[PDB]
Amino acid sequence: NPPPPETSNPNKPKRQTNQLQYLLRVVLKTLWKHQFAWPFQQPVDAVKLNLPDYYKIIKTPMDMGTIKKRLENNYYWNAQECIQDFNTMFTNCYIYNKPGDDIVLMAEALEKLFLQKINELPT
Ligand SMILES: CCc1nnc2ccc(N[C@H](CO)Cc3c[nH]c4ccccc34)nn12
Ligand code: NA
């Protein structure tokens, strides 16, 4: 396993915005409770899960546990930055697997719910 993505970085400029608060309170917390959220709630542990090539293939890992901690720690500058992390997480699943896999069906359902939730954001 490589080290997980950082959730603090003291030199990085941080912001709190209404959209970032919404991404935590509404978007993240809704997706977290979905019946398909559990594979995505923590960094992939390639040793535990017996995926020895996971990090041979996935070079920008991301997961909702990391995203949640980034939001809680005010790590982001803007909502787009956090949205990019969600997109990376979904894309990584599609890259490491293939169409029709159970894990891909999960990611697809979560991605559709995510898009539904970010279709309209606060101002
Ligand atoms: C983000 C996690 C992730 N990304 N690519 C993958 C590829 C395999 C994988 N194995 C899961 C580890 O818990 C267990 C599992 C085996 N078949 C499944 C079908 C649906 C849901 C889980 C599984 N996890 N994985
Ligand atoms: Na919304």
Author numbering: 44 to 166
Original authors' sentences:
BRD4 contains two tandem bromodomains (BD1 and BD2) that recognize acetylated lysine for epigenetic reading, and these bromodomains are promising therapeutic targets for treating various diseases, including cancers. BD1 has four α helices (αZ, αA, αB, and αC) as the skeletal backbone, and they are linked with three loops named the ZA, AB, and BC loops. The Kac and inhibitor binding site (ligand binding site) of BD1 is formed by ZA and BC loops, and most interacting residues reside on those loops (yellow and magenta in Fig. 1a,b; the key residues are illustrated as sticks). We characterized the binding modes by determining the crystal structures of BD1 in complex with four selected inhibitors.
The N1 nitrogen atom of the triazole of the core scaffold forms hydrogen bonds with Asn140. On the other hand, there are also differences between the three complex structures for adapting conformational selection; the indole group of 12 is more bent and does not form hydrophobic interactions with Pro82. The hydroxyl group in 12 adopted an additional water molecule (W2-1, W2-3, and W5)-mediated interaction for ligand binding.
